[PDB]
Design an enzyme around this catalytic site. Structure first.
Site, short mmCIF file in Angstrom:
data_model
loop_
_atom_site.label_atom_id
_atom_site.label_comp_id
_atom_site.label_asym_id
_atom_site.label_seq_id
_atom_site.Cartn_x
_atom_site.Cartn_y
_atom_site.Cartn_z
N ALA A 122 5.20 3.21 7.05
CA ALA A 122 3.98 3.13 7.87
C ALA A 122 2.92 2.22 7.24
O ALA A 122 2.45 1.26 7.86
CB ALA A 122 3.41 4.53 8.15
N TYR A 123 2.56 2.53 5.99
CA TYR A 123 1.61 1.71 5.23
C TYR A 123 2.34 0.50 4.59
O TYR A 123 1.79 -0.20 3.73
CB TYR A 123 0.83 2.57 4.21
CG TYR A 123 -0.49 3.14 4.73
CD1 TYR A 123 -0.56 4.40 5.36
CD2 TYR A 123 -1.68 2.42 4.60
CE1 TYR A 123 -1.78 4.91 5.84
CE2 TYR A 123 -2.90 2.92 5.07
CZ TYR A 123 -2.96 4.16 5.69
OH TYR A 123 -4.19 4.62 6.16
N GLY A 124 3.57 0.25 5.06
CA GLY A 124 4.47 -0.75 4.47
C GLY A 124 4.34 -2.18 4.93
O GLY A 124 4.97 -3.08 4.37
N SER A 125 3.52 -2.41 5.95
CA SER A 125 3.27 -3.77 6.44
C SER A 125 1.87 -4.26 6.05
O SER A 125 1.38 -5.29 6.54
CB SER A 125 3.48 -3.82 7.96
OG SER A 125 2.68 -2.84 8.59
N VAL A 136 0.82 -1.24 0.00
CA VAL A 136 0.00 0.00 0.00
C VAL A 136 0.86 1.30 0.00
O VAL A 136 0.50 2.31 -0.63
CB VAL A 136 -1.06 -0.01 1.14
CG1 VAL A 136 -1.83 1.28 1.18
CG2 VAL A 136 -2.01 -1.17 0.94
N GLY A 137 1.99 1.26 0.70
CA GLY A 137 2.97 2.35 0.65
C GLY A 137 4.33 1.88 1.14
O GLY A 137 4.63 0.68 1.12
N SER A 138 5.15 2.84 1.58
CA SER A 138 6.48 2.54 2.12
C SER A 138 6.58 3.00 3.58
O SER A 138 6.23 4.14 3.91
CB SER A 138 7.57 3.18 1.26
OG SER A 138 7.43 2.79 -0.11
N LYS A 175 -2.33 -7.77 6.51
CA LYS A 175 -1.38 -7.10 7.37
C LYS A 175 -0.45 -8.12 8.02
O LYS A 175 -0.90 -9.13 8.55
CB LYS A 175 -2.10 -6.27 8.44
CG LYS A 175 -1.20 -5.31 9.19
CD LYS A 175 -1.82 -4.92 10.49
CE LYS A 175 -1.46 -3.52 10.89
NZ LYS A 175 -2.01 -3.28 12.26
N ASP A 216 -6.36 7.01 19.93
CA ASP A 216 -5.69 7.65 18.81
C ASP A 216 -6.52 7.67 17.51
O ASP A 216 -6.03 7.40 16.42
CB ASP A 216 -4.33 7.00 18.56
CG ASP A 216 -3.41 7.89 17.74
OD1 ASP A 216 -3.50 9.14 17.84
OD2 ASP A 216 -2.58 7.32 16.99
C1 LIG Z 1 -0.58 4.30 9.27
C2 LIG Z 1 -1.37 3.48 10.27
C3 LIG Z 1 -2.23 4.41 11.11
N1 LIG Z 1 -2.22 2.43 9.60
C4 LIG Z 1 -3.48 2.93 8.99
C5 LIG Z 1 -4.33 1.75 8.60
C6 LIG Z 1 -3.61 0.87 7.60
C7 LIG Z 1 -4.61 -0.15 7.16
C8 LIG Z 1 -4.78 -1.30 7.90
C9 LIG Z 1 -5.69 -2.27 7.54
C10 LIG Z 1 -5.84 -3.46 8.34
C11 LIG Z 1 -6.40 -3.33 9.60
C12 LIG Z 1 -6.62 -4.43 10.40
C13 LIG Z 1 -6.27 -5.67 9.94
F1 LIG Z 1 -6.48 -6.73 10.71
C14 LIG Z 1 -5.71 -5.83 8.70
C15 LIG Z 1 -5.50 -4.72 7.91
CL1 LIG Z 1 -4.78 -5.00 6.36
C16 LIG Z 1 -6.45 -2.05 6.40
C17 LIG Z 1 -6.29 -0.91 5.64
C18 LIG Z 1 -5.37 0.04 6.03
N2 LIG Z 1 -7.10 -0.73 4.47
C19 LIG Z 1 -6.60 0.13 3.44
C20 LIG Z 1 -6.93 1.46 3.44
CL2 LIG Z 1 -7.93 1.93 4.72
C21 LIG Z 1 -6.51 2.36 2.49
C22 LIG Z 1 -5.71 1.90 1.47
C23 LIG Z 1 -5.36 0.57 1.44
C24 LIG Z 1 -5.79 -0.31 2.42
CL3 LIG Z 1 -5.34 -1.95 2.36
C25 LIG Z 1 -8.13 -1.62 4.16
O1 LIG Z 1 -8.72 -1.67 3.10
N3 LIG Z 1 -8.46 -2.46 5.18
C26 LIG Z 1 -7.45 -3.07 6.00
C27 LIG Z 1 -2.41 0.29 8.31
C28 LIG Z 1 -1.49 1.39 8.80
#
Ligand SMILES: CC(C)N1CCC(c2cc(-c3ccc(F)cc3Cl)c3c(c2)N(c2c(Cl)cccc2Cl)C(=O)NC3)CC1
Ligand code: NA
Length: 347
Positions: A32-35, A28-30, A51, A148
Site C-alpha cells: 500500500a505504502y509501496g508506491s 515508505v513501506g511494502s 509517488k 474516503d
Molecule cells: C495507503 C494509502 C491510503 N496512501 C496514504 C498516503 C500515502 C502518502 C502519499 C503521499 C503523496 C500524496 C500525493 C502526491 F501527489 C504524492 C505523494 Cl508522495 C504522501 C505521503 C503519504 N506522505 C508520507 C506520509 Cl503522510 C507518511 C509517511 C511518509 C510519507 Cl512520504 C508525505 O509526506 N507526503 C506525500 C500514499 C498511500
C-alpha cells in the site's frame, strides 16, 4: 536506462526512473505504502515525497482517474491540501508514455503515526481538527467529495501543520492485500449502505470518527466486517426511523438495518466522558445518521470548539471545479494525450 538525466533502480519489486535531481529514494513501506518514496530534490533543495502512479493508462477509467488526480491537485492549492511540487515522466514521447510521478512536500507522518505516539491533548485536537475542516471546506466549496477520509489520508509534520493527501483518488494501484487493508471504520453509513445520492456530508461523518479517535487514542467504530461495522454505528447513534433510513440507503441494503433490534441513541456525554463538552457537542453534530442534519465544514469551523483558531477571512472557498472536459467521452489514447500535456505543462 535511456533518457538523458534519468536513472534507474529497483524499489519494492518495481523499477523507478527518476530525474538526476531526485536523490536517495527510500520506500515508505511494502504494498500500500509501496508506491511512495522519500527523496531529496537537488533542484528544489529540500526533502520531498515521490509517488509513482501504477498503471495510469491500463484502461479508460484509470486514465480518467490519473487525469482527474492531476487536475484536482493543481486546482485545489490550499494551506491544508497536499500540493504538487513537481510532476514528471521518463517518457521520451507519447509512445514511451506509460508512467507518471508526483513529487510533493515531505510531511513524514499521518494521523495514525500521531495517535500512536502522543496522548493528544484537547488543545492539540482543536488545532488538528480545525485544519482538517478548513482544508475540507475549501475542497467542498469546489464541488468535490473526498468519500474516503481516514487518518492515513491526513498528513501532519513536526510543526503540526496538516495536509489532506488525496481526494478519494484510488485507481490502478495495488488492491490485493492493500484493499483488504482498506479500512471501513471512517466511512459514512449512507456510503456503507450504498445510497446513490450522498453529498459532501459523507466526509463530515469521517471527520467525526477521526476527531473521536484523536481524543480517545483509539478507533470509534473499529468494525471487523460489514455487519459488525453497522452494528457498532447503530449501538452509538441509535437505529434510524424508516424515513431517515429511506434516504441513507439503497432499497436492498435497508434489510441490513431493518433486521437489527431497535436501539436508542446513546448519551455521548458517557461515550466521551471527560472530553471538553464543546468537543462532545460538536461530535454530536457530526455523528448523525441523517446526512441532512450533519454540520458542514464551514458551520463546524464556526463552533466554539475552534474559537481559538476560527478566522472567517482566512478560511477561503474555492471556485467550482469545472468538469466540462471530463463530461465528454474520450478514448484511452485521448485521455493519454491530455494527461501527457498536463504532465508536460507543470512549472
Ligand atoms: C495507503 C494509502 C491510503 N496512501 C496514504 C498516503 C500515502 C502518502 C502519499 C503521499 C503523496 C500524496 C500525493 C502526491 F501527489 C504524492 C505523494 Cl508522495 C504522501 C505521503 C503519504 N506522505 C508520507 C506520509 Cl503522510 C507518511 C509517511 C511518509 C510519507 Cl512520504 C508525505 O509526506 N507526503 C506525500 C500514499 C498511500
Ligand atoms: Na493563513
Amino acid at each position: 536506462g535511456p533518457r538523458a538525466g534519468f536513472y534507474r533502480q529497483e524499489l519494492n519489486k518495481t523499477v523507478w526512473e527518476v530525474p538526476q535531481r531526485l536523490q536517495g529514494l527510500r520506500p515508505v513501506g511494502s504494498g500500500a505504502y509501496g508506491s511512495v518514496c522519500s527523496a531529496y530534490d537537488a533542484r528544489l533543495r529540500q526533502k520531498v515525497a515521490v509517488k509513482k502512479l501504477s498503471r495510469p493508462f491500463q484502461s479508460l477509467i484509470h486514465a480518467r482517474r490519473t487525469y482527474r488526480e492531476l487536475r484536482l491537485l493543481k486546482h485545489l492549492k490550499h494551506e491544508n491540501v497536499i500540493g504538487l511540487l513537481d510532476v514528471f515522466t521518463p517518457a521520451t514521447s507519447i509512445e514511451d508514455f506509460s508512467e507518471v510521478y508526483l513529487v510533493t512536500t515531505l510531511m513524514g507522518a499521518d494521523l495514525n503515526n500521531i495517535v500512536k505516539c502522543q496522548a493528544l491533548s484537547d488543545e492539540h485536537v482543536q488545532f488538528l481538527v480545525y485544519q482538517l475542516l478548513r482544508g475540507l471546506k475549501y475542497i467542498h466549496s469546489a464541488g468535490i467529495i473526498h468519500r474516503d477520509l481516514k487518518p492515513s489520508n491526513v498528513a501532519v509534520n513536526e510543526d503540526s501543520e496538516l495536509r489532506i493527501l488525496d481526494f478519494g483518488l484510488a485507481r490502478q494501484a495495488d488492491e490485493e492485500m492493500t484493499g483488504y487493508v482498506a479500512t471501513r471504520w471512517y466511512r459514512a453509513p449512507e456510503i456503507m449502505l450504498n445510497w446513490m445520492h450522498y453529498n459532501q456530508t459523507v466526509d463530515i461523518w469521517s471527520v467525526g470518527c477521526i476527531m473521536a479517535e484523536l481524543l480517545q487514542g483509539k478507533a470509534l467504530f473499529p468494525g471487523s466486517d460489514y455487519i459488525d461495522q453497522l452494528k457498532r454505528i447503530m449501538e452509538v447513534v441509535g437505529t434510524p426511523s424508516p424515513e431517515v433510513l429511506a434516504k441513507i440507503s439503497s432499497e436492498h441494503a435497508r434489510t441490513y438495518i431493518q433486521s437489527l433490534p431497535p436501539m436508542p441513541q446513546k448519551d455521548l456525554s458517557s461515550i466521551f466522558r471527560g472530553a471538553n463538552p464543546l468537543a462532545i457537542d460538536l461530535l454530536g453534530r457530526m455523528l448523525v445518521l441523517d446526512s441532512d442534519q450533519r454540520v458542514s465544514a464551514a458551520e463546524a469551523l464556526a463552533h466554539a470548539y475552534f474559537s481559538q483558531y476560527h478566522d472567517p477571512e482566512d478560511e477561503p472557498e474555492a471556485e467550482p471545479y469545472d468538469e466540462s472536459v471530463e463530461a465528454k467521452e474520450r478514448t484511452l489514447e485521448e485521455w493519454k494525450e491530455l494527461t501527457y500535456q498536463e504532465v508536460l505543462s507543470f512549472k
